[PDB]
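Write out structure tokens for Green fluorescent protein.
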Amino acid sequence: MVSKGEELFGGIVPILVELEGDVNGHKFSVSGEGEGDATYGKLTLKFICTTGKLPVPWPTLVTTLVQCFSRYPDHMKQHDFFKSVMPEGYVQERTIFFKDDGNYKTRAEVKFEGDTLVNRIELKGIDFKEDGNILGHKLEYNYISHNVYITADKQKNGIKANFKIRHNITDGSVQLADHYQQNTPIGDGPVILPDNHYLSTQSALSKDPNEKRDHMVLLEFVTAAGITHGMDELY
Ligand code: NA
Ligand code: NA
């Protein structure tokens, strides 16, 4: 039994991302394009700030800017909420608390438009410090690697997640961005309430040497883990 949701992700799927943001009254828009290959947990994306200069560091937007591309091991596929709701999609909401600084609140809708997987986001940030690490651009442009811990959320027919991103500061210190996440279905198909598990996620950030707009190139890999269902007994 291969679900409709799963069969949607068996090959290379084009991705579009559109974000509108306002952090401390600094308004900005970001567009992204690329592709996802869930068979490999692999994402290739390029984002551009279409309004001019981004008023916050690119690294702080990575997690906001499509966990339906995670590779779920075969023995865990029954726990993949993200693909289970496709093509109608899910709402993804977060609060991201920057320690000793402000917070982002984000709301996104992730769904197919024809054969393209789209992430449409609104981001609002408040309470940031004028010359803190975020509005002062004091974060290095680094590899990001952490686990996303997922739990079921029965009363919204969805999931919650939590994780901590540790952004290095330009003085060698660390800016914590503590993430709280909820996802709930847009449609009303079968409800997948996963057992606890995590997504091991690695994002590599680079620049396109021929691109003069403010932008970010991402190569990302995302793999579900943390559940065995007796697989160990096989060996
Ligand atoms: Na981690
Ligand atoms: Na990577």
